[PDB]
Design a protein around this ligand. Structure first.
Ligand code: NAG
Ligand code: NAG
Ligand code: NAG
Ligand code: NAG
Lengths: 751, 191, 104, 151
């Protein structure tokens, strides 16, 4: 056991990674296994292994070997394993390995071999395993291989072989495993595999086969046959006639178009059959005889009907995937006692009968999403066993049965917009994950179960308004706005006199505000009616016309009020100019027409969401201001940008008129009261519009997150706050209202 | 203080993947242990198995959820270790949690929940009634199962939101009062 | 990081050289990559153009395997026959005890 | 949405009892998984270890908290699976929780927290900075450890 070679008592010497440049010397004459891999031997001199007559295993991996003398391996009459992978050999050393009369395993992979001499492998009468993959071979070495009748395993992968000639393996009767993956094989002659009667595994993955390899019919003992990642498109009838013992076929990642109907018949040992993308197949494959199938997969085809005897033939079937087809009617699944997973999504099933799923005692996962199911029998799931996952999402469901569903863990029904009824929570004891078309169906299950969509603050379950403080505040706003708006309207329009533009505009803002008051009253009345049970009313309210009407009223009132404020401020500025410009303003008819135009614009703005779908149904409040949508965000940002532009326009107009206004001009002039009133109105309106605008801008900025209840409460408390506030300033701060009320009192007393 | 227990059953597929079936349960976190969340392989365990001080016969891996089924005190006139002692010993033997079935002995509820100054770092849960019998059926019927005790923090923390609601209500009321005081002041000044 | 192109201290090697095998070594709680010229016992090399990876010999009763379903040598007490391990040599074949495989 | 990860260490005393040392950590619950509390034995998994579709090599017991350290994206120009796919595969292989070390891949948080309509039933956590290096040191130094993700 001379240094630097490690040595144990089993006659095995290890010298890997010692940086040797030649074979080590001084070792025991009785060495049986020598390992000199990972060394730096770039050449083997003549008779370099004359000191190891009893050698049996030799390794030269990773040595950058380039030239081997013909007599280098002389005297190795007991060599059994010789490895030469990961080197710089460019031709197979036929002369050197001629004397190895007892070799059984030879490795030549990961080299730069390009040509095999015709006389190679002579004398290797005991060879069993041959490695030749990862080289630069361009053709099958038929003649050199013909000298190895005892070969059992041969690999030629990762080469540059283009085609296989006829009778390339006429000898090699005892061959069992042949590998040819990652080659460039495109053409196989009809009798290329003749003589391989004992072959069991054939590998042809990652090749360029265009047509089906008909030559495989001369392999009666085939068990595995893989040609996936190829260019095979059509598999003709009786393709596997000559291989009755097939177990697995690898044919995925292929441009498959059509499959013969009787291609996969008999084949009594086939275990799995997965075919995808066979878009030209119309009938279910004729699987008579195939009784050992444990998994079926036929997706992307035009299959329309499932044969009835599918469960009678495939006794041991475990998984059945038949998605992406044109299946309309389902057969009776009785007898598929071993069936566990069924996938039928993206089909055209329009109903489920009572007996469709009878006898599936082992069913665990069932998929039926993206179908046209409009009716499910009430007892359709009575006979199920440990069913854990059910999926009926994206269908035309109107009611959902619940018997026998106690064992469910995950259930999906998202997309069934026609499903309005509420699921009973007592029939889903073990349910853990749920999905429903509307969040209001999730209220019953939560025991305050990860269900979606979440019943957030914007979609309440018990109380529409929420806290009692918010309810009281909204009630107070409603009553104050209603009563004060009637008072102001009656006072302003109860005198049959000429109405100046200021008084007309104040009354017009008041009547506009009356509709926001009506909207708040609708909110409080709906909340009071649905006190504690809003979950039942939520779906009917949102999908019904009531939400549309309330949202239209709110939007119309807000926009009409804003535009009326714009026109009133413009009129005030114009009249202020005209006071010393002409002394007489004659724009009454024009201002009336402009007010009508503003009202019609508000009406069209309110009616715009009606044509769109789902804009008004985001929240039970029926306001466009969302919790985050892609269309509603656009509509709201357009509206709020218009409002902010309006606000800055009125602000700059008011600052301009204040700058042009002289300080002493406000001492006793009557219009001073009106201009102060308009200033206060714009003050409160612009102040109270900021929170809604900033919360609608909030989801555009990801750096700030607000819990839903905050925006819900501030919108409930601030959107109609100007509604109640605006007439209060007019009634309690405008001296003109005093004389107007006195005139109305005199008129009432006279009548 | 409510405890939610999930019992998971494994089925090792030949390919190597796992299929799970979870059974819900409800218990109550005892005051003798922290109200944390735990998880570990379920290990059935006789009440008298903790009596022996020779632990060499019970070398389990760390992180096993213990399940103990108590019995009538009549058949055990002299319990060598109290229920709290049993929980402590089980935790010392590497149990990540202890689940007691106190349906047979209801006094164990008040024995665990009595005022004690020595809580355990791992949760101690007690179950009774139909839940206890269901858990017992699963543990003595299935071979191996994994328990997942979830603390499930209580109803949504509406504290700060409620303070904001009161802030808004107070702001509205103060605004109303300010407007009223301003109006009466102006009335007095004009009068 | 022996025979490695991109190495890390936690994951070991992440990409071996061109003609080398990438074997994932499981050391208790720690897993990391490794590059070897030949797959260890119980594994078979699978050449591929993007990377060569070791895979476990799925054939039962096997120590060293040429491929997925071909065993070069089984453990003691089992007989080699067409790359299959048999506790006894089937009909028409007699056991050979000296070097442990079936013979005619 | 922050996650508190506790690392526990064992030493089986001859008498039979166990003594535990605990070490704190801090991660973030990724949106790709539910924000539940998990616990199990820590098992580091190579990023390329989730590529293989033959799981027969690595049949682990249910309830292992997997720790995966992602590598820099230029070192993996073509990935077999996205980070979400890797986490889903790990959950398939019986993992009760998945922890990603995203110090070298700052975009992993981006493709994890991104809007996905198929959240995983088990929590997915990512760590970075001092916590990540401390966790990796614990992984590659101690023989065995058990993680306790809390919420
Ligand atoms: C291997 O030997 C060659 C030929 O002498 C030499 O050029 C080369 O540096 C050696 N490589 C090593 C020692 O890694
Ligand atoms: C190979 O087969 C051919 C055709 O049958 C035959 O002529 C030849 O002798 C065989 N070679 C060997 C070495 O068995
Ligand atoms: C299906 O296969 C059976 C058995 O090979 C055969 O008798 C029958 O004619 C085939 N049917 C069709 C429609 O091809
Ligand atoms: C399968 O082939 C055998 C003969 O090898 C024949 O007896 C049997 O009827 C065939 N079955 C089918 C379904 O074609």
């Amino acid at each position: 056991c001379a240094a630097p070679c490690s040595c144990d008592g089993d006659r095995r010497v290890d010298c890997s990674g010692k940086g040797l440049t030649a074979v080590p010397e001084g070792l025991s004459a009785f060495t049986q296994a020598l390992d000199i891999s990972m060394n730096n031997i770039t050449q083997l001199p003549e008779d370099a292994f004359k000191n190891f007559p009893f050698l049996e295993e030799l390794q030269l991996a990773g040595n950058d070997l380039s030239f081997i003398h013909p007599k280098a391996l002389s005297g190795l009459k007991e060599l059994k394993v010789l490895t030469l992978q990961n080197n710089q050999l460019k031709t197979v050393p036929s002369e050197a390995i001629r004397g190895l009369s007892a070799l059984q395993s030879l490795r030549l992979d990961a080299n730069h071999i390009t040509s095999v001499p015709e006389d190679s492998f002579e004398g290797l009468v005991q060879l069993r395993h041959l490695w030749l993959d990862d080289n630069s071979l361009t053709e099958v070495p038929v003649h050199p291989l013909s000298n190895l009748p005892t070969l059992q395993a041969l690999t030629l992968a990762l080469n540059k072989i283009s085609s296989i000639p006829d009778f390339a393996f006429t000898n090699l009767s005892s061959l069992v495993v042949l590998h040819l993956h990652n080659n460039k094989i495109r053409s196989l002659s009809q009798h290329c595999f003749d003589g391989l009667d004992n072959l069991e595994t054939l590998d042809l993955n990652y090749n360029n086969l265009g047509e089906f390899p008909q030559a495989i019919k001369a392999l009666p003992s085939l068990k595995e046959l893989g040609f996936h990642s190829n260019s095979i498109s059509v598999i003709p009838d009786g393709a596997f006639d000559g291989n009755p013992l097939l177990r697995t076929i690898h044919l995925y990642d292929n441009p498959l178009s059509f499959v013969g109907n009787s291609a996969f018949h008999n084949l009594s040992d086939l275990h799995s059959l997965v075919i995808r993308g066979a878009s030209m197949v119309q009938q279910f494959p004729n699987l008579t005889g195939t009784v050992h199938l444990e998994s079926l997969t036929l997706t992307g085809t035009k299959i329309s009907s499932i044969p009835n005897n599918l469960c009678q033939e495939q006794k041991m079937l475990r998984t059945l995937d038949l998605s992406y087809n044109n299946i309309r009617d389902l057969p009776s699944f009785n007898g598929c006692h071993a069936l566990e997973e069924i996938s039928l999504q993206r089909n055209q099933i329009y109903q489920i009968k009572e007996g469709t799923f009878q006898g599936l005692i082992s069913l665990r996962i069932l998929d039926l999403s993206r179908n046209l199911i409009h009716e499910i029998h009430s007892r359709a799931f009575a006979t199920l066993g440990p069913i854990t996952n059910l999926d009926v999402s994206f269908n035309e469901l109107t009611s959902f049965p619940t018997e026998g569903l106690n064992g469910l863990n995950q259930l999906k029904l998202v997309g069934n917009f026609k499903l309005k009824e509420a699921l009973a929570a007592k029939d889903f004891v073990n349910l853990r994950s749920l999905s429903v078309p509307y969040a209001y169906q999730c209220c019953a299950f939560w025991g305050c179960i990860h269900c979606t969509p979440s019943t957030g603050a914007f979609k309440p379950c018990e109380y529409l308004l929420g806290s009692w403080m918010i309810r009281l505040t909204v009630w107070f706003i409603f009553l104050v706005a209603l009563f004060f708006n009637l008072l102001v309207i009656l006072t302003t329009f109860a005198s049959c006199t000429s109405l100046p533009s200021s008084k007309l505009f104040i009354g017009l803002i008041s009547v506009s505000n009356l509709f926001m008051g009506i909207y708040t009253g609708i909110l409080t009345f709906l909340d009071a009616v649905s006190w504690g049970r809003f979950a039942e009313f939520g779906i009917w309210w949102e999908t019904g016309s009531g939400c549309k009407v309330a949202g239209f009223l709110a939007v119309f009132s807000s926009e009409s009020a804003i535009f009326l404020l714009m026109l009133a401020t413009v009129e005030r500025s114009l009249s202020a100019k005209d006071i010393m410009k002409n002394g007489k303003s004659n724009h009454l008819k024009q201002f009336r027409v402009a007010a009508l135009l503003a009202f019609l614009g508000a009406t069209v703005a309110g009616c715009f969401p009606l044509f769109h779908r789902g804009e008004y149904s985001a929240s039970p409040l029926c306001l466009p201001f969302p919790t985050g949508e892609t269309p509603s965000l656009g509509f709201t940002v357009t509206l709020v940008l218009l409002n902010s532009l309006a606000f800055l326009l009125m602000a700059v107009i008011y600052t301009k008129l204040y700058c042009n206004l002289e300080k002493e001009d406000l001492s006793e002039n009557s219009q001073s009261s009106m201009i102060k009133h308009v200033a206060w109105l714009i003050f409160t309106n612009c102040i109270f519009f900021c929170p809604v605008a900033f919360f609608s801008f909030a989801p555009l900025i990801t750096a700030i997150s607000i819990s839903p209840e905050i925006m819900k409460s501030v919108t409930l408390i601030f959107f109609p706050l100007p509604a109640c506030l605006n007439p209060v300033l007019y009634v309690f701060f405008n001296p003109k209202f005093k004389e107007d009320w006195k005139l109305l009192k005199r008129r009432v007393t006279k009548k | 203080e409510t405890a939610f227990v999930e019992v998971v059953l494994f089925e090792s597929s030949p390919s190597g993947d796992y299929t799970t079936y979870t059974t819900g349960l409800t218990g109550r976190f005892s005051r003798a242990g922290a109200t944390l969340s735990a998880e570990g392989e379920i290990v059935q365990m006789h009440p008298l198995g903790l009596c022996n001080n020779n632990d060499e016969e019970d070398l389990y891996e760390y992180g096993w959820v213990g399940v103990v089924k108590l019995e009538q005190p009549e058949l055990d006139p002299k319990p060598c270790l109290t229920v709290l002692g049993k929980a402590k010993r089980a935790v010392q033997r590497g149990a990540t949690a202890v689940i007691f079935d106190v349906s047979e002995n209801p006094e164990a509820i008040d024995q665990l929940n009595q005022g004690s100054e020595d809580p355990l770092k791992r949760p101690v849960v007690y179950v009774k009634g139909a839940d206890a019998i269901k858990l017992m059926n699963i543990v003595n019927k299935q071979k191996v199962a994994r328990a997942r005790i979830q603390h499930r923090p209580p109803r949504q923390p509406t504290e700060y939101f409620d303070m904001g609601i009161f802030l808004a209500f107070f702001v509205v009321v103060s605004l109303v009062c300010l407007i009223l005081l301003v109006k009466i002041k102006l009335k007095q000044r004009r009068s | 990081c022996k025979g490695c192109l991109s190495c890390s201290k936690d994951n070991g090697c992440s990409r071996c050289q061109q003609k080398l095998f990438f074997f994932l070594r499981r050391e208790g709680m720690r897993q990391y990559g490794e590059c070897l010229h030949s797959c260890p016992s119980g594994y078979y090399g699978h050449r591929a153009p993007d990377m060569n990876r070791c895979a476990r010999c799925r054939i039962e009763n096997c120590d060293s395997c040429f491929s997925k379903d071909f065993c070069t040598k089984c453990k003691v007490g089992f007989y080699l026959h067409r790359g299959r391990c048999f506790d006894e040599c089937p009909d028409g074949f007699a056991p050979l005890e000296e070097t442990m495989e079936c013979v005619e």
